[PDB]
Amino acid sequence: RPRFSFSIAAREGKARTGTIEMKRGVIRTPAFMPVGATVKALKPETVRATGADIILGNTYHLMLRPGAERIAKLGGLHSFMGWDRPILTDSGGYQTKQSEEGVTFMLSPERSIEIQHLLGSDIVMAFDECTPYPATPSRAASSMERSMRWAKRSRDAFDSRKEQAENAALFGIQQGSVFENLRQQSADALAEIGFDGYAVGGLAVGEGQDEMFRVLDFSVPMLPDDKPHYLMGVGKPDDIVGAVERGIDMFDCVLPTRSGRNGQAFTWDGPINIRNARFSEDLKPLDSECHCAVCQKWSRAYIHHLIRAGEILGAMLMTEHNIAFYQQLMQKIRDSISEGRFSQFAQDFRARYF
Amino acid sequence: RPRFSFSIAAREGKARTGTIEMKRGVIRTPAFMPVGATVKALKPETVRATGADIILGNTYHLMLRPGAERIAKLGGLHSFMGWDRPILTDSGGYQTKQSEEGVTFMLSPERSIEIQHLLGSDIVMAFDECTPYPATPSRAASSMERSMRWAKRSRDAFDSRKEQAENAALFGIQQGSVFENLRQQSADALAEIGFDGYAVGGLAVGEGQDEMFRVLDFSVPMLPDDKPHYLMGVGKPDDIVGAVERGIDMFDCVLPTRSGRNGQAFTWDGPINIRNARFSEDLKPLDSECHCAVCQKWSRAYIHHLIRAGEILGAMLMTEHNIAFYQQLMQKIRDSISEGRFSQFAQDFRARYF
Numbered sequence: 167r168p169r170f171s172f173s174i175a176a177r178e179g180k181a182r183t184g185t186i187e188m189k190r191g192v193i194r195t196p197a198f199m200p201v202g203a204t205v206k207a208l209k210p211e212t213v214r215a216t217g218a219d220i221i222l223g224n225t226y227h228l229m230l231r232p233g234a235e236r237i238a239k240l241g242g243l244h245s246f247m248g249w250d251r252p253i254l255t256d257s258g259g260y261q262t263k264q265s266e267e268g269v270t271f272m273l274s275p276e277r278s279i280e281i282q283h284l285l286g287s288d289i290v291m292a293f294d295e296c297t298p299y300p301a302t303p304s305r306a307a308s309s310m311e312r313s314m315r316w317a318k319r320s321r322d323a324f325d326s327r328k329e330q331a332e333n334a335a336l337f338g339i340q341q342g343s344v345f346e347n348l349r350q351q352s353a354d355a356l357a358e359i360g361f362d363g364y365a366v367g368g369l370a371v372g373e374g375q376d377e378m379f380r381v382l383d384f385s386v387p388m389l390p391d392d393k394p395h396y397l398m399g400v401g402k403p404d405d406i407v408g409a410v411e412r413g414i415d416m417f418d419c420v421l422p423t424r425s426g427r428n429g430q431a432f433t434w435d436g437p438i439n440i441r442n443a444r445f446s447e448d449l450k451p452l453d454s455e456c457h458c459a460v461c462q463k464w465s466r467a468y469i470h471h472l473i474r475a476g477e478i479l480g481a482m483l484m485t486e487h488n489i490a491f492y493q494q495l496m497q498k499i500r501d502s503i504s505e506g507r508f509s510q511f512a513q514d515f516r517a518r519y520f
Numbered sequence: 521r522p523r524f525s526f527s528i529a530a531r532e533g534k535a536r537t538g539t540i541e542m543k544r545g546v547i548r549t550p551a552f553m554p555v556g557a558t559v560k561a562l563k564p565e566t567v568r569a570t571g572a573d574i575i576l577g578n579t580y581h582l583m584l585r586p587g588a589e590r591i592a593k594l595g596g597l598h599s600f601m602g603w604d605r606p607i608l609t610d611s612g613g614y615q616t617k618q619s620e621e622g623v624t625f626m627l628s629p630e631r632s633i634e635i636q637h638l639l640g641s642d643i644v645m646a647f648d649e650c651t652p653y654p655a656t657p658s659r660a661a662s663s664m665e666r667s668m669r670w671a672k673r674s675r676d677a678f679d680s681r682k683e684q685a686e687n688a689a690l691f692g693i694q695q696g697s698v699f700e701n702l703r704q705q706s707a708d709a710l711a712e713i714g715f716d717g718y719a720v721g722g723l724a725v726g727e728g729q730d731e732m733f734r735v736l737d738f739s740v741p742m743l744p745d746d747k748p749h750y751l752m753g754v755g756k757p758d759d760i761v762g763a764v765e766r767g768i769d770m771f772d773c774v775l776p777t778r779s780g781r782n783g784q785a786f787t788w789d790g791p792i793n794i795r796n797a798r799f800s801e802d803l804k805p806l807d808s809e810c811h812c813a814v815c816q817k818w819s820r821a822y823i824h825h826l827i828r829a830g831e832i833l834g835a836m837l838m839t840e841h842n843i844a845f846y847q848q849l850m851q852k853i854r855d856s857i858s859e860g861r862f863s864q865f866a867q868d869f870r871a872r873y874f
């Protein structure tokens with residue numbers, strides 16, 4: 167496989183399905199990336215069995231513990247955690263004294279790219295500022311412009327590290343809050359620098375689905391069509407469907423994992439809270455259709471018991487199911503786009519989910 | 521398979537190796553029984569892969585949540601938790617207003633046997649009193665005598681339930697504290713009633729290994745030779761070896777599970793606490809020889825990181841390793857007895873473990 171190759175196999179409206187080929191493996195798009203140096207309560211083999219092709223790691227948390235340098239000493243993140251497929255790392259740009267140099271908590275564009283190198287990241291995110299919401303036009307602009315200067319510094323840091331440049335990919339992050347002209351300026355800046363892929367940053371920061379969707383409507387077309395489009399931090403199953411309808415190819419969210427531990431299970435009929443007393447003697451699986459190993463073997467009643475009891479196995483089972491659900495959603499999306507029936511799938515999904 | 525058949529295949533001194541055959545499966549002895557309606561942080565398939573043939577459940581905890589009747593409604597403990605092999609249940613006699621009728625917390629011999637039935641237990645423990653340590657001779661005697669009266673009531677309750685009597689086994693529990701004459705009286709009483717197996721109760725209650733061993737020296741020979749001998753709540757790897765040298769066939773302990781979650785890993789060179797800084801960059805597996813999946817795939821360094829971070833996967837990995845260690849210990853014991861070299865194994869084990 168090449169360092170990076172994105173190929174679109176089929177389209178329906180703005181939606182696309184295809185593959186990203188990288189040295190450590192192939193990524194099917196639209197893709198959901200479970201978030202980790204562990205995907206909480208799952209062994210990597212379990213993550214893989216659910217259908218994930220790539221997972222996310224984090225510059226900020228890993229740099230604190232166990233340390234970037236320590237992980238490199240030990241062989242890199244892949245060997246450390248036992249996941250041999252691609253890993254995307256965020257830059258630390260979401261998760262203090264700020265300056266043009268970077269942020270003291272030190273993290274700058276250069277340090278962020280170095281940490282991702284030390285971790286052995288396959289997909290490296292530029293170091294950005296995730297603009298708070300709401301933001302005035304002035305502040306959104308100032309923040310966006312800084313991020314574009316940091317995007318150039320990120321590019322140059324990545325490129326000056328031969329091993330990194332030859333084996334990893336670099337994504338740029340569009341900012342601009344909810345303002346069309348700032349999103350356009352940002353897209354233009356990023357395309358001028360040139361990246362392997364383009365994220366839509368600064369959303370899922372409290373604006374609400376309708377606003378998020380309105381911003382995606384004009385922002386995604388601004389990005390290079392022939393490169394992947396990554397919506398950072400999204401989201402609920404319905405957010406995902408609507409975002410793919412607007413041209414997004416990649417997603418990460420802590421919801422399936424976090425939710426899972428707190429008792430929320432995703433189903434095709436909508437989310438359920440398994441701790442509710444109504445499930446205490448319910449012998450059916452979490453979801454009627456789900457092909458995951460949890461739904462093949464255990465009942466709602468048992469998982470209800472486990473979560474109310476605080477048992478670790480409850481977290482394990484809920485998290486495996488939810489990540490499997492998300493991957494099954496992505497597979498249905500991929501298949502429906504490839505077959506030219508995604509708009510019908512989206513409508514069907516929504517009518518049942520809601 | 522029959523309801524219950526114990527066969528001794530080989531002996532060395534007081535040590536024995538063989539099999540217990542029951543309807544849900546075969547149990548290799550000497551046996552270690554992991555303790556659970558979950559073996560903490562492990563799926564049942566994982567428990568089975570470590571080599572366990574039987575696991576333990578608990579009358580007391582299950583009767584509180586989710587309830588005995590509720591579990592029966594749902595199909596019994598085996599279907600509920602997804603473990604289809606034998607299950608031994610304790611009576612609640614270790615774990616309030618006491619009277620000859622039973623104990624109010626209500627639990628009596630009759631209720632205890634009924635709860636174990638409702639759970640679908642394969643090996644049912646008589647309802648007893650675990651005599652506090654230290655105990656004077658008077659109190660130990662009074663307590664032992666009550667337990668023997670409760671043993672008869674347990675026998676009669678079990679026998680009056682046809683389904684239970686035809687499909688499950690019943691073990692009696694010897695008491696008498698540390699006093700030889702009370703242990704003999706108790707053994708005699710239990711043999712007169714007649715059970716499928718005989719536990720040594722009232723040990724591992726703070727007396728210390730030397731005293732425990734001295735009591736086993738005279739107490740185990742008092743029990744029927746042709747029936748299994750179960751030492752309740754023991755213990756550390758070295759307790760297990762010494763107890764098998766004294767005629768014990770079955771063991772349960774929460775140590776491998778509890779220890780695992782708290783950072784203590786068992787190794788052939790003795791226990792280690794994985795949180796110690798010395799393991800932070802140690803790429804070796806938990807144990808050099810261990811065949812478990814954890815030692816095949818992850819380093820001390822990674823598990824160190826996980827446990828210090830409070831990650832669930834750390835508990836999962838530590839617990840799988842420790843239960844695998846215990847099963848490998850049992851296999852080495854079984855093999856060494858069958859080959860007539862257990863005394864040498866015991867000495868070798870101790871010299872390296874300590």
Ligand SMILES: Nc1nc2c(CCNCC3CCCC3)c3[nH]c(NCCc4ccccc4)nc3cc2c(=O)[nH]1
Binds near residue numbers: 259366371421
């Ligand atoms: N560099 C960068 N990162 C962003 C992130 C983090 C994406 N997940 C990273 C993982 C790395 C490890 C942790 C996260 C975002 N996450 C969200 N929404 C999350 C909202 C949410 C919160 C809790 C639950 C569900 C959703 N918006 C984000 C915007 C940006 C952004 O502009 N720039």
Ligand SMILES: Nc1nc2c(CCNCC3CCCC3)c3[nH]c(NCCc4ccccc4)nc3cc2c(=O)[nH]1
Binds near residue numbers: 556645720722753775
């Ligand atoms: N009916 C009965 N049960 C006893 C138990 C419980 C055995 N494990 C049951 C499982 C069912 C679910 C929970 C336990 C005992 N456990 C111990 N020692 C444990 C000491 C220990 C404590 C903590 C960690 C390691 C060892 N002595 C015991 C004596 C008796 C006894 O006479 N009668």
Ligand SMILES: [Zn+2]
Binds near residue numbers: 456490
């Ligand atoms: Zn499922």
Ligand SMILES: [Zn+2]
Binds near residue numbers: 806807811812813841
């Ligand atoms: Zn191991």
